[PDB]
Each structure stands twice: as structure tokens, then as C-alpha cells.
């Protein structure tokens, strides 16, 4: 209806999810996703993550597993249900349950 | 002494009087007079008067019994909802709660300083109670039939379509016998019952 899924991913996953229909340019004419290449810094990535968090029109986010590891403290600094944040694997980093903030909230449930 | 049953005198008189008319302190603080408990009270004259009310009216006994059941179920649901903050009020619970709340507000308290309340005869009471049980019955039947079949009917559509019926039902209280005859008021009760029937048919 009004909220749009957003993707912070490397080039291949980003093409994959743009191909699945995920993607918009808002009235402000900006992408609702970010491209991750080899040459990026954790600090501006964290500021863009904050741009995502504070913006109201997202709901759910989709971040790779090593990309989510690269920003782990800032990622886990947020605890609110409405901005859902979900982790996905990648080609070279299959899924890892031991590395996940929400499954860390479920402490001792193993 | 103290407004309770501890004293020997109140115990002894309670143990030999046929009919007890316990009066609530809290309802006396609520100013919904007369402040009758309706729960700690009793009377051992139902059964004898059953024969009387069958010979003359043929309608009072089931209406009265249902009135007690609905009031009591409201009391029990009140005792339940205190903790959950009425969050778990379902549809049937809502109908029961509203029906008994209306019974409290319109037909369980009178104003002794006004012409339309200083005295209600038997037949007038029977008419109002018949009307109460009537709308309860029709509302419950409608919601049950629609929940079983399709397009469940909730209290929101009920309030929307038949606000006039409910207003008329609350305003039966003011059918002043002092300034009006018996024929007018009885025809009013019958015509409001038929209006409720017609409105429920419209919403069916």
C-alpha cells in the first residue's frame, strides 16, 4: 500500500532484487537501495543505514550476511519492530544462524 | 453497624425474613437510585407468583428470568475484564455487556422527583422488559446467523443502522403516564417493537 521494501546489497544481489520488482524513485528522486562494492567505508555506510532507519517509508530492509557483519554494532544498536531488519546470505557467505542480531535476542534458545 | 452482615441482629433478622432487600453502598455512592444490590438479595415469592403471572400475562416469567441471566453475565464479565482492560471483549461479550448496561441505565433506576418515574405499574414494567429481551434476542440471532453463514455482523454495523431504534428504546423511559393515557404508551411500546423488527429486517 504505502511502505516499500529496501535493499542494501552488493552488485549481484542488488541486480537480483531490482529484477524481482523491488525498486523505486521517490518524489525526492533517490534510490531506495544502496550498492556495496569493494571500496566503501563503514562510517558513511552507517550514516546511510541511519538514513534508512529514520526514513518512515521502508518497513523491511534486506542486508547480506557479511554486509550486515560489516556493520554489526550500529546494526544492533536499533531495537524496534516496525523497522524490521532481515539478514540474507550471499554467494560466498552462506547463511549463518550464529551471526544474527535477532537470534542473539533469543539467547540460550539452542 | 458498619454496613455488613457481621452483627448478630442483622444475621438473626436475615435468618427469618422471607424477603431480603440488601442495598449497595457503592450504588448509593453512584446515585443511580434506588441503590439495590440485585446480587446479595433474594425473595421466596417467585414460585407462588408464577401462577398469578401466568393467569394474567403469560409473558412475564421468561422475560424476567432472562433479565436476571443477562444482568448476571454482565456482572461476571465485569469481574473478568478488570485486568485485561476490556481488550478481550469479543462480539457476543460486547452484545451482552451493552444489553445489560442498557438494562442498568434505563430500566434499573428511577427519578422520584419527576412525573414519569414516581410510579411504574406492573404492565408497564412487563412491556419495557419484553422490549429489552426482544432486542437482545434479535441481535443475538442476527449475529449468530451471519457468523455461521457469511459476512459476520458486528456491533458497529448494528449501532450504525439502528441508532434510531436504540434511542427510541432508551426514550421509552419518558412515556409519562401522568400526562398520557395507557393506550398511547402501550401503542408506543408496540410500535417501537415493530420499528425494531423492521430495522433488523432491513439490516438482515
Amino acid at each position: 500500500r504505502g511502505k516499500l521494501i529496501a535493499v542494501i546489497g552488493d552488485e549481484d544481489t542488488v541486480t537480483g532484487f531490482l529484477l524481482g520488482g523491488i525498486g523505486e524513485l521517490n518524489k525526492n528522486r533517490h534510490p531506495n537501495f544502496l550498492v556495496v562494492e569493494k571500496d566503501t567505508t563503514i562510517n558513511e555506510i552507517e550514516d546511510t543505514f541511519r538514513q534508512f532507519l529514520n526514513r518512515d517509508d521502508i518497513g523491511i530492509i534486506l542486508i547480506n550476511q557479511y554486509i550486515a557483519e560489516m556493520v554489526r554494532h550500529a546494526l544492533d544498536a536499533h531495537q524496534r519492530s516496525i523497522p524490521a531488519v532481515l539478514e540474507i546470505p550471499s554467494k560466498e557467505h552462506p547463511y549463518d544462524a550464529a551471526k544474527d542480531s535477532i537470534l542473539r535476542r533469543a539467547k540460550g534458545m539452542f | 453497624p458498619g454496613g455488613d452482615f457481621s452483627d448478630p441482629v442483622t444475621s438473626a433478622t436475615l435468618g427469618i425474613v422471607q424477603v431480603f432487600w440488601g442495598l449497595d453502598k457503592k450504588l448509593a455512592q453512584r446515585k443511580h437510585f434506588p441503590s439495590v444490590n440485585w446480587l446479595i438479595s433474594y425473595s421466596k415469592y417467585m414460585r407462588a407468583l408464577d401462577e398469578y403471572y401466568d393467569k394474567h400475562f403469560t409473558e412475564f416469567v421468561p422475560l424476567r428470568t432472562k433479565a436476571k441471566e443477562i444482568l448476571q453475565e454482565e456482572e461476571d464479565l465485569a469481574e473478568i475484564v478488570q485486568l485485561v482492560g476490556k481488550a478481550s471483549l469479543a462480539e457476543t461479550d460486547k452484545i451482552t455487556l451493552e444489553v445489560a448496561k442498557l438494562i442498568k441505565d434505563d430500566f434499573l433506576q428511577q427519578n422520584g422527583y419527576t412525573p414519569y418515574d414516581r410510579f411504574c405499574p406492573f404492565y408497564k414494567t412487563v412491556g419495557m422488559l419484553s422490549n429489552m429481551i426482544s432486542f437482545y434476542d434479535m441481535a443475538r440471532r442476527a449475529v449468530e446467523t451471519t457468523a455461521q453463514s457469511d459476512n459476520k455482523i458486528t456491533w458497529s454495523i448494528i449501532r450504525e443502522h439502528m441508532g434510531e431504534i436504540l434511542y427510541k428504546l432508551s426514550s421509552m423511559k419518558f412515556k409519562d403516564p401522568v400526562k398520557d393515557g395507557e393506550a398511547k404508551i402501550k401503542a408506543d411500546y408496540a410500535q417501537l417493537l415493530e420499528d425494531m423488527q423492521n430495522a433488523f429486517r432491513s439490516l438482515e
Partner: protein
Amino acid sequence: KDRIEIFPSRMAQTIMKARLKGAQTGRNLLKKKSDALTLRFRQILKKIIETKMLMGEVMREAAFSLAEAKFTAGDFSTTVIQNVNKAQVKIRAKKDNVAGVTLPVFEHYHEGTDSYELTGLARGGEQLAKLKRNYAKAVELLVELASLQTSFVTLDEAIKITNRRVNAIEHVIIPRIERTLAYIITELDEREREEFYRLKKIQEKKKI
């Protein structure tokens, strides 16, 4: 603090016994709600791991489908990344009354503006279409996981507050009321015995 402030009496005994009964019923009712909440928590966590494994393998499906799409077409990446105008998939937020507390959930929407058509990348449209299908199915399963995860995160604090309430009720008020009732029974006994003795002394005096 350790005793509810009231004058001891018989009526007071009745009111305090009633208040104790009310506290007990509240405790039992809270226990039932906690049972339902932990049931919801367990059933939510029942197969999140399973569905997440399905997610991982389906992502790998889409991944090597992309690997094979890197073959026929070529350098499509920038062509796609530039062509970004509108979304064909959207979140239709719904509600889920799992218990007495309601948690938001989501729904998979096909908005309607079809996926765009790139027929010029050296004529490799078939691989792009099967890749579209793969990522569409993946995104469906992912919105399902997102709904589940949202409900889990809110239901956690819901359970915490309920458990705190029942614990505070069972370890504060009930002992307090029980001690107050013990004190009240003692005081009533004292008061009756005083009258007994003084009456006895009248009786004895009357013998003379």
C-alpha cells in the same frame, strides 16, 4: 508496608479475605495468559530455522541463475542499475491478532507495473525471465520471514511485561494480605477474651 492499613474487625476480615481471593484469581488468569504467550513464542520459533534454511538454498538458486545469466547477455548490470523508475512489488501492511496483543504483519503485493523488458542484451531474454521467477519466489518467502520476525521481536517484550506483572503480584501482595489477616484474627481473639474475663469477674463478685 508489611500490613495493609485498616482497623482490625470482623467486617475487615471479610473484605481482606475477598481481596485475597481477587488477587488469587488475578494470578491464575495471568498464568493462563502467560501460557498462551509462551505457546505463541514457541510456535513462532518452531520452524523459523527451517524456513531460513529454505531461504538460504533458494537464494543460492537465484545466485547461480544469475551466474548463468552472466553468460548469454554480458554487462547487463549497469543497464539494469540505471533503469530504475517504479516498483512492481509492495508491502501491504496487515494486522495479526496472535493473542490479546496485536502485532503488525505484511502481505506480498503485485502492484501492477510489470517488470521491465531488456531485449537488446545480445538477445538473452529467457535467462533473465527465469532469474525474475527465481528472485520473485525468493522475495515472497522473504516477506513471510519478515512478518514472522516482526511478530517475534514484539512478542518478546510482551512476554517480559506479562511475566513481570505476574511475578510482582505473586511475590508482593499475597504475603502482605496473609500477614494482615493473621494479625486481624489475633486482635479479634484478644478482644473477645478480655470480655470473657471481665464477665467472669462480675460473676464471681455476684457470689458475695
